[PDB]
Amino acid sequence: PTACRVCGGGVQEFLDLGRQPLSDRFRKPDELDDEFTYRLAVGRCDSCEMVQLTEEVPRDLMFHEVYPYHSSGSSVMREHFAMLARDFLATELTGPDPFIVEIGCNDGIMLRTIQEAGVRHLGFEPSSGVAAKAREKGIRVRTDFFEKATADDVRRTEGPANVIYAANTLCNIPYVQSVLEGVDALLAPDGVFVFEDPYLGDIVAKTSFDQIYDQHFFLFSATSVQGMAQRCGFELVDVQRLPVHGGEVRYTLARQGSRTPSAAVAQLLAAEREQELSDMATLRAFAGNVVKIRDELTALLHRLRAEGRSVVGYGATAKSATVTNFCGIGPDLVHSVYDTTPDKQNRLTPGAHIPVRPASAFSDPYPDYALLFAWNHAEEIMAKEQEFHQAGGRWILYVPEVHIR
Numbered sequence: 441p442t443a444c445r446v447c448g449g450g451v452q453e454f455l456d457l458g459r460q461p462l463s464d465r466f467r468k469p470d471e472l473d474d475e476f477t478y479r480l481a482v483g484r485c486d487s488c489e490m491v492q493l494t495e496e497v498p499r500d501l502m503f504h505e506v507y508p509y510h511s512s513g514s515s516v517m518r519e520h521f522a523m524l525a526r527d528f529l530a531t532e533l534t535g536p537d538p539f540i541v542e543i544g545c546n547d548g549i550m551l552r553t554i555q556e557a558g559v560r561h562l563g564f565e566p567s568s569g570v571a572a573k574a575r576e577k578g579i580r581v582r583t584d585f586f587e588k589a590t591a592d593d594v595r596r597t598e599g600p601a602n603v604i605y606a607a608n609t610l611c612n613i614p615y616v617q618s619v620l621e622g623v624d625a626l627l628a629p630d631g632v633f634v635f636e637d638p639y640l641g642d643i644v645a646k647t648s649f650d651q652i653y654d655q656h657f658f659l660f661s662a663t664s665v666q667g668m669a670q671r672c673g674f675e676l677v678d679v680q681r682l683p684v685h686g687g688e689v690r691y692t693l694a695r696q697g698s699r700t701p702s703a704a705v706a707q708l709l710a711a712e713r714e715q716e717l718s719d720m721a722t723l724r725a726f727a728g729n730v731v732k733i734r735d736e737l738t739a740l741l742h743r744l745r746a747e748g749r750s751v752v753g754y755g756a757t758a759k760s761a762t763v764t765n766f767c768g769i770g771p772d773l774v775h776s777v778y779d780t781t782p783d784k785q786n787r788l789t790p791g792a793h794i795p796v797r798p799a800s801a802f803s804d805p806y807p808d809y810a811l812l813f814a815w816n817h818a819e820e821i822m823a824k825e826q827e828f829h830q831a832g833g834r835w836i837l838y839v840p841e842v843h844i845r
């Protein structure tokens with residue numbers, strides 16, 4: 441079997457999503473039809489309750505020079521991060537000469553606000569293309585993975601960080617123990633390590649299995665994060681639920697006993713226990729619901745084809761690779777996917793090879809239906825696409841259930 445990456449306990453599988461391609465590899469249509477594949481399956485550790493994948497994709501296959509995800513492509517997320525950065529400037533970064541390190545800064549969506557406040561900072565961004573976009577904004581970026589050794593190097597040259605922050609990144613990192621030792625080396629004795637990532641609670645409640653793909657190794661909960669912190673010398677001292685990305689929790693870790701946990705921590709712990717969130721039977725029931733969504737979504741897509749209705753997709757999310765490859769959905773059922781990311785445009789989606797076209801191409805004459813892969817961006821997207829729905833075009837969603845509206 442698989443050893444738990446947090447505690448070395450045994451991992452029990454509950455969901456097997458089969459062979460999957462790299463989720464963010466978009467091929468030109470002339471490229472050879474070969475792709476790396478791996479088995480995507482999810483289990484839960486016996487000892488610490490951490491839900492995690494059973495096969496790791498090597499980091500350098502996922503994060504490198506042409507990694508295509510551009511965080512700044514969403515107006516809602518640009519606002520969400522600017523606000524988080526102001527909240528840190530008002531609270532944890534008030535000292536003389538404060539220092540904030542962000543793990544996974546991407547194109548600088550968060551750090552831009554810190555730089556504009558004149559505060560010392562450093563972004564770690566091992567994907568050099570998006571790192572260069574952050575540096576264009578005047579952000580200080582290191583094109584390296586955060587891990588024990590690179591944290592030590594930053595401590596040596598830059599001194600302690602008052603805040604270490606990671607969004608939608610820590611759950612990507614199976615070497616979380618090395619990151620934690622990095623945090624231990626680098627964080628001020630009275631600092632915080634704050635991270636926010638897709639929440640197990642939301643994934644189980646919404647059956648949002650597309651949150652499981654190569655780059656999302658862990659599905660954190662308050663229960664497993666508390667365990668992970670404790671084992672590494674930290675303590676879970678705050679939690680905040682966030683609506684972004686289909687539902688997240690922002691976890692705040694401090695050195696143990698240095699701050700008193702908020703009431704929020706015990707409250708969420710108790711709700712997770714009450715709701716049996718991480719019980720193997722709950723997680724197996726989620727896995728049964730995942731198969732039901734597969735079966736209903738393919739039946740719908742096939743019925744639409746039989747009735748001569750046109751179907752496209754909207755948003756070439758990484759998540760969508762799980763949906764198209766587990767469900768067997770290709771360009772015979774969903775003809776194109778529309779997306780705002782130039783480096784995904786005029787390419788094929790991974791595994792399923794549906795052509796991706798610029799969102800500006802989604803215009804009159806509209807298709808009958810758009811399968812909404814960027815369902816976590818529904819409000820922002822539908823506000824930009826009122827004319828489609830006014831014209832009679834309808835959305836197909838598969839979270840939390842297959843439905844059309």
Ligand SMILES: Nc1ncnc2c1ncn2[C@@H]1O[C@H](CSCC[C@H](N)C(=O)O)[C@@H](O)[C@H]1O
Nearest residue numbers: 503511543544546564567585586607608609
């Ligand atoms: N060990 C590590 N250290 C720092 N960044 C990492 C990393 N492993 C992956 N990454 C970066 O983590 C990012 C995850 S995507 C999330 C980016 C942004 N924080 C947002 O929330 O939108 C990618 O840009 C990826 O290259």
Ligand SMILES: Cc1cn([C@H]2C[C@H](O)[C@@H](COP(=O)(O)OP(=O)(O)O)O2)c(=O)[nH]c1=O
Nearest residue numbers: 514755756757758759779780781814817821
């Ligand atoms: C917000 C928004 C996103 N998109 C595209 C951009 C990204 O390629 C994709 C959203 O991806 P996202 O859900 O942020 O991430 P992931 O890759 O983790 O699933 O949707 C649009 O085309 N239009 C929009 O208005």
Ligand SMILES: [Zn+2]
Nearest residue numbers: 444447485488
């Ligand atoms: Zn464990």
